[PDB]
Amino acid sequence: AIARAIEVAREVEKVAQRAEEEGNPDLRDSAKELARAVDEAIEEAKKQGNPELVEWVARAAKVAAEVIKVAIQAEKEGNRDLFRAALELVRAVIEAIEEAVKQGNPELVEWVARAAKVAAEVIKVAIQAEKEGARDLFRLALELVRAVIEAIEFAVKLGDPEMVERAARIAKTAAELIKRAIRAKKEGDKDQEREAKKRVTRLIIELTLMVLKASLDLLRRILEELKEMLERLEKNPDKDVIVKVLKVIVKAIEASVDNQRVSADNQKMLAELA
Amino acid sequence: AIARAIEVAREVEKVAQRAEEEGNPDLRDSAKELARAVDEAIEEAKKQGNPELVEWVARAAKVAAEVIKVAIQAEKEGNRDLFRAALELVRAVIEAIEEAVKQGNPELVEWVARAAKVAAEVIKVAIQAEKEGARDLFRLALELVRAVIEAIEFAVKLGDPEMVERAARIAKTAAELIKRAIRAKKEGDKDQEREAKKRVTRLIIELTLMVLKASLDLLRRILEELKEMLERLEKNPDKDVIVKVLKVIVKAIEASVDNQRVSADNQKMLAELA
């Protein structure tokens, strides 16, 4: 199809950007996984049948190619922390697209592509905080991109596209508030700049709260899976059944550690807010 | 006794309110469980012997009957979220009374009846926020009733009547501050209204903090029960002993998930406060 042709062209551009950074192998490592994931995504999409799913994978991969170009720029100039944030966004989009396509959602991959483009804009706003001296605003943008990454990863687990949409609209609203805070910082008026930056911190907290409740909903589902295996264990206390229960117990620990990790970062945002 | 007679009369009023809402079966489902629980409570009380316990179950059941009348009103008018909050309070009082009577506490059921009447007043204040346009104040009242429900449920687990008393005095003090915030909103003076609403949010946080520490005290007791079964396991690594340990491990997970659930809701109150 015509949409499949612009994907091959997008794939060709990705191959060029993958071969462009022959000097840095670490980014080229994740740059090749994006070529592998998209190839798997397109072949998995044509197996599924939905052509709408084939189009939204392209737009997200088109955004991921530009984020890779930011990862190349992040080495020579900008913070090295920005490079890791660019790579974290790349691997997050790769894993989010794969699982969302394996789930067979034509709408979840859409908002994943929508949120990835919005998160790409926030990274661009972070660069204005580097040229125009604003390391504090540079953190807010990196903290916001971090909150979007956690929102996308957990919403793909839930398979809820509405959560990705609501996380993208709050992120896009916060990005324009950082742009207004940058235009403020340029034009003085720090009574407006400080109120805009606290509005952004409020929106970063509003995102991490939705991520915390989503991780809590996953912790409930694992709890029910653990309850049904206990009621199974009371019937047949076998040797292999206990091994499976131990595996599910550790799976619940992984989700609780991530839930305590989000609340640990969300609690620092409140200390910055107040 | 004379006190037992006003309980039968209170039981007759409950039967009438249970039969009044013949149209809605879902509320009638929980309305009949209250008739079953009180009957069990009165028969359990006369088996225990203490007549003071028989009186405080009546006053709480008299309050629960009026909350049911609010649940009937909450369908045709008011928020549907208010109906679920009314039902949540009913099932919470039912389970709190049962466990507190099975524990044999003549003082815990008292403050449970005291806190249930105070929580009923807060629901009444929420209705003033519906007529007098105040959806923000409507949340604060529903958030406050939610904090009282968690405070009563965990304090009945601890069997601590002093915690219920202190949660009821903070809730009654906060309710009068919402009334003052409503009388403020009526008479302008939003410098006083905004300070009264933030005083309420501070008290809602002060309650959820006491609920979080109480759930943490329960998490310690389960930890000691898990330690004593490990030291038992080192003596006899049997097949059935491991099954009991797995059950206690999941019981600790249920308490930790609830503790992370309270802190997740308590953290949103801080975002609203600051």
Add this chain to the structure above:
Amino acid sequence: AIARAIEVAREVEKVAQRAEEEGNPDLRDSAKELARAVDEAIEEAKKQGNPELVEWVARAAKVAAEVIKVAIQAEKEGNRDLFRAALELVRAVIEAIEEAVKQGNPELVEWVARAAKVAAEVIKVAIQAEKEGARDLFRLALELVRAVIEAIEFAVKLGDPEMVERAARIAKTAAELIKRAIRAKKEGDKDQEREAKKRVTRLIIELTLMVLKASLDLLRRILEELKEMLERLEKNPDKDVIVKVLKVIVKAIEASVDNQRVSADNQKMLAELA
């Protein structure tokens, strides 16, 4: 050596202070464990060989002797809560020194001695809040010492001396801000006093956040130890292997309960801040 001689003299002073409080047995219980721990520490240090480790154990034990003298003073005068805070600091320094010496760190014991002396200064500032009427400032100092105790205990687990140094510099900066808040409270100017006390609360939160992330790093290491034993269990689902996995699962629960305990106390600091 000459340094070993001032340790024997310091040990003699500790024996005198241990025998001075013959009336109170509970403090004498922990006072004798300090004599046992230092004796073990000096003998363990001469076995290790490093003479620098022998010197820093003395300075921390010299500070711990003065904290014991505060524990004696805390009975007849001052809050009884201050006595428990003094004992908590003593047992924390005892266990921190022991583990840090068994780990063989000549630099971790240094900053443990540095942080113990800084924490001793904060306790002295708490006494000024008792004479000069300031129970609110008395809590801030006791809350700050509590945050230092948690910071030292978890950093000794990590074996990270840089964390102890950064926790000591924030604690010393906060202590001078409480001194400035006390000199403010004396000389009126509550616009400066209230801003200094909120600066201290911000620094107390900044410490507990570093303690929360450190406890989260320990929770990751236990997670990897639990993953490697699962992959071991898939190879050999034995009887004794499951027992060891159950022990590691409970070890992870102990770390998660402590992590939820720190966040529970850190969340009350935000309610006091905002």
